[PDB]
Design a protein around this ligand. Structure first.
Ligand SMILES: Cc1ccc(O)c(CO)n1
Ligand SMILES: Cc1ccc(O)c(CO)n1
Lengths: 115, 115
């Protein structure tokens, strides 16, 4: 509260660390469904069903232009990529399986890096 | 943004300074309408019309128990006291005039202390 400060993380390396994690995500062989925005003009249903589209290129742009206030807003956007994938794609599908794999991959990097 | 820190105020004295300002408010001769909560059982209309009642004793309790995260939330509650007063009381009235006087009194102390 006012004039009662909680000891806080050293957050000085967060930007570099998130960039490294995102690079690992981008270079994963199962990243292909998530590198670019879903084409709203060519994919039926997507625009109406997925209220907040997100993809790695968009995350990279936001990270590079100071659009994440902190760690957690970055992780929210990454998780949004996989939440959208799960909403739109059957678990059994190639894209569906890619999403589950990439989510697991991310969360391990996340824990190992910040926890 | 992430890992880009803005130079910040020294806020270490804010708690003490707000307490001093509130003491000056409490001891002002025109503070009498605002020292205790308006009696909702005895004052017709108040409960329905004033959605967020506030008074100096309530502010003092919140300040003393860590319920203001920062300066600005404290100032919001003080201003709420006078906004409520203006809503419910004619400018011409004793209480109405007291509110205008106390608002002016507060804002001068506020500027002189933090600006
Ligand atoms: C390329 C791609 C990636 C993710 C996704 O949900 C879709 C829609 O089937 N398409
Ligand atoms: C004592 C007091 C203080 C402020 C106020 O608005 C009222 C309602 O007339 N009564």
């Amino acid at each position: 509260s006012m004039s009662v400060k909680k000891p806080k993380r050293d957050d000085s390396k967060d930007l570099a660390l998130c960039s490294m994690i995102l690079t690992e995500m981008e270079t994963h062989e199962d990243a292909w469904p998530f590198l670019l925005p879903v084409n709203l003009k060519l994919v039926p249903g997507y625009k109406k069903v997925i209220k907040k589209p997100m993809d790695f290129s968009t995350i990279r742009e936001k990270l590079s232009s100071g659009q994440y206030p902190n760690l957690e807003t970055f992780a929210l956007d990454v998780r949004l990529v996989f939440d959208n994938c799960e909403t739109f794609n059957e678990d059994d599908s190639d894209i569906g399986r890619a999403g589950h794999n990439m989510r697991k991959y991310f969360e391990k990097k996340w824990t190992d890096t910040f926890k």
